[PDB]
Amino acid sequence: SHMDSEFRYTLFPIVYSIIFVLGVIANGYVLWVFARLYPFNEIKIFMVNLTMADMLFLITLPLWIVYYQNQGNWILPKFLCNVAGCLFFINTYCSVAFLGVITYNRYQAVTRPIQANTRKRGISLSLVIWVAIVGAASYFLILDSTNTVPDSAGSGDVTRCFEHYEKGSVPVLIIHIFIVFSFFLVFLIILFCNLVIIRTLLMQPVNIFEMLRIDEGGGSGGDEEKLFNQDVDAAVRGILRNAKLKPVYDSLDAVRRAALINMVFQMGETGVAGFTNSLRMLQQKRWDEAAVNLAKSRWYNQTPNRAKRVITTFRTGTWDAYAEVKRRDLWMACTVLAVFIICFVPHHVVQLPWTLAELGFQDSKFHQAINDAHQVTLCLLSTNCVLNPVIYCFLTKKF
Amino acid sequence: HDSSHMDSEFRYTLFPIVYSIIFVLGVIANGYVLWVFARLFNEIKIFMVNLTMADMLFLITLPLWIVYYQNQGNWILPKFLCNVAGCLFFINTYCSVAFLGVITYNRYQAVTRPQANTRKRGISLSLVIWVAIVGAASYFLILDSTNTVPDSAGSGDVTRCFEHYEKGSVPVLIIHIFIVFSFFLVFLIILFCNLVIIRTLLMQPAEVKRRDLWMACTVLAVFIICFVPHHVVQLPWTLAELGFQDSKFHQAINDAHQVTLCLLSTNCVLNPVIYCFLT
Ligand SMILES: C#Cc1cccc2c1c(C(=O)c1ccc(Cn3c(C)nc4cnccc43)c(F)c1)cn2C(=O)N(C)C
Ligand SMILES: C#Cc1cccc2c1c(C(=O)c1ccc(Cn3c(C)nc4cnccc43)c(F)c1)cn2C(=O)N(C)C
Ligand SMILES: CCCCCCCC/C=C\CCCCCCCC(=O)OC[C@H](O)CO
Ligand SMILES: CCCCCCCC/C=C\CCCCCCCC(=O)OC[C@H](O)CO
Ligand SMILES: CCCCCCCC/C=C\CCCCCCCC(=O)OC[C@H](O)CO
Ligand SMILES: [Zn+2]
Ligand SMILES: [Zn+2]
CATH class of the missing domain: 1.10.530.40 (Lysozyme)
Structure with a gap:
């Protein structure tokens, strides 16, 4: 079936069920908090755009619960798997991008505290990020998402969804190297910026x-x-x-x-x-x-x-x-770092060795360990739709 | 900030006592195990000699720290030796962590999935470890390690060695986040590797199985006793040195830091113990 197979068929149906219900409540209520706010403006756009990214993922979750409840059999049409994979990539990197741009905005607001067309910039940037990520994610719609294999028992087959990697694929390795290096480059910028904001606003x-x-x-x-x-x-x-x-x-x-x-x-x-x-x-x-x-x-x-x-x-x-200056910013910086180190960093640490194992370049004993790890990071990355709505407390709550 | 260091007299008592014991014991146990190897599985033996060389490097710096803490934190010796002391302390810490981990992985793939190619593989891997660690340790040689600061008694000035931290430095903090995170990544691969060894060795159905199982425990003893206390403290203490904490926390974490620094030095005396649990 697969290496990590045993528990993944139990993990994802439970984990993704909790996430589906919490994430639909959290992002739905967040669209109520956003609606009930007519009087920060730039940050507001990024937050709403981040919720739009969460909705795209959240809606795919029922399909993953069923896929894993069917012992990893994609029984729906192939393109629904292409779309599912595509929207996972969108959720992940729009979240990395919108958290990145929230951090930079807050960093500039603390580091350089000096028109109402600031909204026009939030919309302008949000579109750039969407075109950049939706454009990259579109490649998932031109791939062969599924692969059919004979079942272990019975007369049947098993249809995996975005699990198949042609043994020894070079574009896959280059693409996965680029993305991880681009991620930790982005993570370093976020880490530095949020640590400056924190350092500045902590030290009296x-x-x-x-x-x-x-x-x-x-x-x-x-x-x-x-x-x-x-x-x-x-x-x-x-x-x-x-x-x-x-x-x-x-x-x-x-x-x-x-x-x-x-x-x-x-x-x-x-x-x-x-x-x-x-x-x-x-x-x-x-x-x-x-x-x-x-x-x-x-x-x-x-x-x-x-x-x-x-x-x-x-x-x-x-x-x-x-003594206690710009606390909205100090807590924003901590929250973005929490969401980044919790959801995105584990997955991106585990990604390159797991791709190498999945292209066969690593031994069976390790391939099994890194696959188990991979199922855990994939769950951590999904908590982003439940965790990232917490940032809205900057807009609502006062200190 | 160097004024907050006159409140800890504990380190000037602790380090000359403990480093003299560690120096003598270590120089003896390491000098001894170099005769064990001289009067002579083969890949594992390569990692052990290298691990002993990492220890010797730090052992040779111990008399300098003994003198330093003896003179109430005054680097009376040449200022360049201070860069060399810091450099070799880093080499010892992470060459130990790497070679122990590379020993742990040799015994993992030798238990879960069991001559001229292994000797050559072991030397390859060993040279990678030295290049990687010495490469990072070399940054200690281009720093300004020494800072002249006033003493607890009067207007007299002492010379500190690798005690100065620029207030609120975010890059200093990023480096320490990198090293503490990497350590716990490396340590958890080790913890899993060793716990799989002790599990597979407890559930096998006589002498060969008995030593390698008890060896996986030695590597863990060294990690939990020497390296894990220090890497737990490293971040809260770094933050205290960069001015991110209160004076009460500052003293608590700085005292704990002296203990963990002493515990990190016990690895010189505790890791030659691996030589018998395999050879
Ligand atoms: C993140 C990312 C990424 C970025 C760029 C290329 C990626 C990926 C990527 C994935 O890591 C990936 C992994 C699993 C799946 C499908 N998938 C599966 C099998 N279970 C999932 C549970 N939650 C979300 C998605 C799940 C996927 F659609 C994409 C595979 N990719 C790939 O090269 N493929 C040839 C599929
Ligand atoms: C390990 C490590 C490390 C890794 C990366 C940067 C490090 C360090 C580092 C240290 O932890 C460090 C701490 C104390 C000292 C100096 N030191 C002192 C004052 N007492 C010592 C007793 N034993 C060994 C070394 C001792 C040092 F050379 C390095 C300081 N570093 C640093 O940021 N500096 C500005 C020197
Ligand atoms: C077939 C499946 C693959 C297709 C997947 C399509 C992904 C959806 C594209 C954009 C999300 C739309 C929401 C955000 C885009 C508008 C950007 C903007 O300007 O934000 C305005 C802001 O909301 C003012 O308050
Ligand atoms: C292969 C050996 C890996 C060593 C395992 C130690 C594990 C302890 C974790 C962090 C401390 C060590 C940080 C060393 C990482 C390299 C950073 C560096 O700047 O070293 C330059 C290198 O020579 C050019 O790549
Ligand atoms: C392609 C060229 C790339 C070259 C770019 C460097 C990459 C840095 C790598 C690891 C961090 C090492 C930490 C650097 C140590 C800081 C040293 C320093 O700032 O100088 C001493 C200062 O005077 C205090 O006493
Ligand atoms: Zn696999
Ligand atoms: Zn201090």
């Missing part, structure tokens, strides 16, 4: 460099905070060279000096020098009065979250304002 600023990294941004993680030190020193040099800003600056403590520096990085010496009254309240250590007067500016209307953070730093002289 204790200086002006870390403080301006949250509010203004800064690419990757380097120590050679030394280049940015130069920009701050040049900013302080000018502040002290300004008769309107020097008395206040000199009078302030190091944490409050950073808040003034922050303001200067945002609106410049010119901008900050036009806060005569608020600056006088600071020079006189009238923290609450200064804080209240600072909230009565256009700065507060224009950038409220940064203003609130800087005003708090002026009021308290502590870094508490930067």
Whole structure:
């Protein structure tokens, strides 16, 4: 029949049954959460496009349950197997692509925090990804999906679906090598991006460099905070060279000096020098009065979250304002990494040795072990339709 | 961050004691087993000599760490020796993991599916392992291993060896994720391979079957005692060194790290034990 055969005919009918029911509930409810949202916009498109990918897979699951309940016999017409295989490839790589693009969006939102045609970009990208993956998945519709073999007992035959690999196929090896190398290349980008977001939003600023990294941004993680030190020193040099800003600056403590520096990085010496009254309240250590007067500016209307953070730093002289910043993003980063390492990485680790075993290039004792592993990763990869809807909690839930 | 290291005096007591014991015992047991092989299945014997060479490399670095921890974490010796110490410690850790795993797989295919080609195959595979591991270990030679930092008592400056970690480094963290994941991938292939050996050896229907079954247990003993404690701690500790944790966790995981580092060194003394359970 097959190497891993024994348990696969029991595994998939149970595993895929749970997944079918949970995944149809989770993605169906997610289309209720999406519908009830008319007031993030770009991320919303990727999420809805990701659900569209899940629906395509979920609908094929009844066919796999029956195929495995029939001891691996594809009794329906051949093209329904072509379509089933095709939609599996679509689900997997649209999910890899849409999780990838959600990660990049959030990375740019944290790393570079600076039109309503952002929606036009989410739609533009989603289409590129669909054309790229549906185009690649189309090859599954031109293949001979099934192979007929004599049954072990009786007078019958067994019709396998996308299990047959012509012994020693070279295109198969090149295609499977490309996909795995392209996957871990994509996985490395995702891992780096989500670890930057996490690193940035976990590690609470204790200086002006870390403080301006949250509010203004800064690419990757380097120590050679030394280049940015130069920009701050040049900013302080000018502040002290300004008769309107020097008395206040000199009078302030190091944490409050950073808040003034922050303001200067945002609106410049010119901008900050036009806060005569608020600056006088600071020079006189009238923290609450200064804080209240600072909230009565256009700065507060224009950038409220940064203003609130800087005003708090002026009021308290502590870094508490930067303790739990952008938690929607911090949790998004963890969730995308969970969905990636759980669902996609196991399958992609097991993929190249299993293809080599299935092209015969590996021994019978290993071929049997890697086949068993393969059935487990194929189940892990299917949990994606139940797991990936969790990301919607970024849109709904507040911290 | 180097200021958080003045709180752990434990390592300066632990390493000079434990590394002196490991050095002497190891140099003896390894020097001894090199005479066992000199006064002489054949493929397995090739992996064992190489595995003993990985041990010697690290054993020769032990007197340097003894001196280092003796001088309260001050690398009094030349700074280049620090790169060489780190390099050889990495070689020892992963040449051991590879050669033990390659021994485990030799006995797996020799039990589940049983001369001049095996000797040549074993040398091939052995040279692959050295090239792969020494290739990665060589990156320790191009780093800035040493960092001058103040001492617990006064304004005096000590020189650390491979203790500096750039705050919030994502690539340092990615490397450690790669190595910890690869280790548990390699270890689980080993765990399965060995457990199949002990299962097939427990259910076979006299002396040949009795030694190879008890050998699969030695490879597991070495993995669970020496390598698994360290690779469990490696990630939580790395995170602590990159500033991703609290001071309370920092101290807990750093102390555990000293224990697992000592436990990793016991592999020099525990792996020559495989020589008898086969030859
Ligand atoms: C992912 C992927 C992939 C990417 C590119 C080429 C692929 C694959 C691919 C598969 O790994 C693959 C494996 C099993 C099947 C069919 N399949 C089977 C037999 N059981 C399944 C349980 N869930 C989903 C699909 C299942 C399939 F349609 C594609 C086989 N491919 C292939 O080269 N074939 C010649 C089928
Ligand atoms: C294993 C491994 C590894 C793999 C990849 C990168 C590694 C490491 C690595 C280490 O774990 C590491 C830790 C401590 C030391 C130095 N070290 C110290 C301070 N005490 C030691 C006692 N025994 C052996 C080595 C000792 C080292 F050379 C390497 C540090 N690495 C690193 O990121 N550095 C910036 C040195
Ligand atoms: C015969 C079987 C093989 C054929 C398989 C066909 C796969 C389906 C193709 C696209 C999914 C459609 C959903 C997403 C495509 C629209 C992209 C877009 O612009 O997203 C707009 C967004 O939803 C605005 O809110
Ligand atoms: C064939 C021998 C494989 C060794 C089994 C060790 C298993 C322990 C897992 C990770 C630590 C070792 C990481 C070594 C992986 C190679 C990375 C590298 O950069 O090495 C360069 C190499 O020479 C050019 O490919
Ligand atoms: C085709 C050319 C490809 C070449 C591209 C390299 C591929 C990196 C491979 C493994 C990671 C090795 C980790 C690199 C070690 C970091 C060393 C470093 O950054 O330098 C020392 C620094 O000054 C701190 O003291
Ligand atoms: Zn097979
Ligand atoms: Zn530390």
